[PDB]
């Protein structure tokens, strides 16, 4: 098979990987999916960059809301207005601050499939379409911001940003499975060794980042 | 560890020794089969004819 | 095609169990092969057979067997009308137990 | 044979498991699904996570409150009401708090089957559940937080959410089975190695996910 | 093939790779590019210094500031005006800081693809750049340096200061995965540490440049 | 080939890396430059002696400069009169003192490709040609010293400062890279140890030179 | 010239799979060769050219 | 690891064989080709003549 150089969508790395696992026949391209399939999923299971983080507008009907299914970590949320960052506690917390609580920060805790709050904040939707040309945030509406799993390709021409940036990354891990059908069992590691090199090259190009304007302290004093 | 059996075609069905003794390809029993050079493949069938 | 009471002496003592995984031919042309394997825990006996499998030339490369008696036997059978397959060869992978 | 390029189920993944291990022949198929129920087993051993877990109200009536049967290990525990957290405790403690009655902090033991609350608490729910009643949730009673025992598969279109999210997964650990039942240890080694460093990227996440927001490490209440 | 002394570009390195690697067939050259692709991508992924870096003006216009696609990571960031260095901190304090309004240690932070700074800055750009405007450097606004992704080779003639500077380090590293192509590891292995040391010289480089002059460990000034 | 004693030039060196390895065939002899260019460019990458330095006058126009294209590292920076060596600070510093400054000693800081100074100085480049017999030096001017690249060879009689001093340092450093192409893996490390030991050879002759006269204490006290 | 399905039994065993890089003659004269390369998965195929 | 195939004139085509089982230098197909002793090389073309 051949390739393009600039290897961009799900259709041309299925052919690529059949072209750097060289060998082409039945009982292993038609494997190809699945073994894409195992490689992002082990891959997405921990990674966090900022390129897969996500918006969202909450609904909290009383103090509580639902965890949306696309969810899997949580990180800094807010109001649309004004700020104040909320921050995240225990259930045995939280429930001993209702009990005797009958300017005051913001905390939240999870019971399983649902989101509380002790304030019993009150937040609504976009009031959405009509004419549809703007998206109008309501009054009294939080801001979310969490990291959301990326959609399985299942589609050629279909790409992610991940083939964008680094396409040898799933390349690589996608070949470590490959080599598992056939126990290539030096390949394993080759691939293995490569990919987590690639892999761990994520982080820190990340927490260089999100330090890197100006390294200092923490001016956070209460008065 | 392996038992490559080669050359299948060396000899055929013995008797007169023991099944343990043989060679790997001291190969031992045939029907309708047929062992030339190297190699083992079915032998003529039987049809009619007028 | 038949050949009882394999004990694979060339290469590791008779009494041992040797766990059976593949026969791994070398075949030639198209047909169809049915192939057995067996095996008794006594160098005297024709052993019962434990399964059986059909081979088909361009599809499958080799087949699977699981055994570990130390006399292995394997039966091959060819009963296909348009079949005019031949073998060069075998590869019997496997490996070894232990003995009492 | 063959798949699809994801594997959503059973119904293939009995056959694509056989497939990674090339040499398919039925004294090894017909335990294929044997192969799963170990590894499945094997892993809800010690796996623990939010989709498994479970809402549910509680009848304490006279505190001999019980066991249910799916049950497996608990997260959290509490009333639909004012949100109060119980905690839990050792008999040899709420054996005292009886011969001490005066429980605002309500506490809870495992007495084989059943659930002990020092309190004579009274939550309930209908007899044998015909219904007919959503009752206002069972007139808002307590709610259970715990981690279930999932069905073991008994159906090729049968199917889990690992499936949807993590196959390889479960293809791994059977292959473990599956390749101890015919002696090829080294794939074994390999097989399990990647099954463990599949698993533990999850319950990673899981924990990146628990805590976020950054939470102090526990507001000190007075009170 | 052939070269020149000089390696100035793509359009002779894609061929002096292939020499390097003596056998140059091409189910191999094909894939050259690819290979370049996935190196310069493993270098910028961590590799930090000037030639790459950029002035800019910013348009705050209520603190949403945005980020642009370009980015990296940032070195520093300031004012045209007077020389004003900002510094950066998390939302938990910046909110903070609005909940107490009274300013002159700005400080800023990243919410997703968002800048934020405390103080409601209004530096401007125009709107999209049809220019016809120096505008004084658009009204001598803040002014950001920070390290950009550079472009991907897409040409023969096409260039960049590595290979006017530093190429052999470029044919190293994708020596590597073209020997990672084809199965030759101990050439893998002399590629990438070669790659490695080549690097290394340069980081050392860097840092031997910053901070030259003696400068105190740092002048405490009292104000 | 053949080639004379006193090796001084960049056309004897490229016959004499063909002697040395003493394979002489179009596939090796073609790729020479590249060869010494990239022993040439890990060499200067971290490599800092006086006879590569150089002086320069600034052109400082208020309190700013532009890095010379040729810049490497930093050293020394004075004033033509009087002395008054400069020292080098953060731009979380010097940012501090413009504002709350509105006999004073000098900072400067790096923005980029710029320089900057504190005091706002203003310097002129020497006033140049017209008859040209002299360069008088302009009132008013700084002076400042700091690490060049060497030019690249680019022609056969071109000569270096390296090869009049250790021209064996390229031969063997060139030779690591001829190794690398025809994998001579025993040939790479024994070039490479004699090259740094080589290579290393120089700096243990720099710091016993600048601190030879008399090695004394600091005598350098604020009254 | 060809030869079909070389399995290298005489180095390593048959159904490992085996990275080739690099064939090495030693021609003698004048001319100009054309070499090609191919493989199948089982034993018994003429495998498809690469 | 190494396969190498010397002496290719030692034997031309061969059939009745396993294309597994085949020596080294037991390599086969020609058409056009021309062995002797220890070289291989094209047999000589047919040209008209008057």
């Given at each position: 098979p051949d390739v393009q150089y600039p290897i961009n969508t799900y259709g041309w790395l299925k052919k690529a990987v059949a072209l750097w696992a060289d060998r082409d026949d039945d009982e292993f391209v038609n494997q190809i999916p699945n073994f894409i399939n195992f490689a992002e999923k082990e891959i997405y299971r921990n990674l966090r960059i900022p390129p897969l983080e996500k918006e969202v507008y909450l609904?909290?009907?009383?103090?509580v809301a639902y965890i949306p299914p696309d969810y899997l970590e949580a990180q800094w949320m807010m109001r649309a207005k004004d700020g104040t960052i909320f921050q995240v506690t225990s259930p045995e917390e939280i429930s001993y601050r209702r009990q005797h609580g009958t300017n005051q920060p913001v905390n939240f805790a999870r019971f399983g499939s649902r989101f509380i709050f002790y304030p019993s904040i009150e937040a609504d939707t976009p009031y959405y379409?009509?004419?549809?040309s703007p998206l109008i945030p309501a009054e009294n509406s939080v801001i979310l911001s969490y990291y959301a799993d990326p959609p399985e390709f299942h589609e050629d021409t279909d790409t992610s940003t991940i083939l964008t940036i680094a396409p040898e990354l799933l390349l690589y891990f996608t070949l470590r499975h490959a080599c598992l059908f056939v126990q290539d069992d030096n390949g394993v590691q080759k691939w293995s060794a490569l990919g987590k090199a690639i892999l761990d090259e994520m982080v820190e190009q990340n927490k260089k980042q999100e330090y890197s304007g100006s390294p200092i302290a923490i001016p956070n004093n209460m008065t | 560890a392996l038992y490559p059996i080669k050359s299948l075609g060396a000899v055929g069905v013995i008797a007169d020794q023991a099944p343990t003794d043989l060679?790997?390809?001291?190969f031992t029993n045939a029907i309708n089969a047929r062992f030339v050079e190297q190699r083992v493949f079915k032998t003529g069938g039987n049809a009619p004819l007028s | 095609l038949e050949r009882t009471?394999?004990?694979?002496?060339?290469?590791?003592?008779?009494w041992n169990q040797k766990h059976i995984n593949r026969f791994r031919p070398q075949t030639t042309g198209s047909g169809t092969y049915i192939f057995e394997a067996g095996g008794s825990q006594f160098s005297n006996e024709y052993g019962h057979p434990h399964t059986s499998k059909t081979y088909t030339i361009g599809v499958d490369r080799h087949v699977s067997v699981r055994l570990n008696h130390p006399y292995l036997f394997y039966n091959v059978i060819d009963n296909d009308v348009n079949s005019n397959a031949a073998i060069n060869g075998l590869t019997i992978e496997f490996a070894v137990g232990g003995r009492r």
């Open positions: 609904d909290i009907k009383d103090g379409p009509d004419d549809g | 060679a790997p390809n001291a | 009471g394999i004990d694979f002496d060339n290469v590791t003592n008779e």
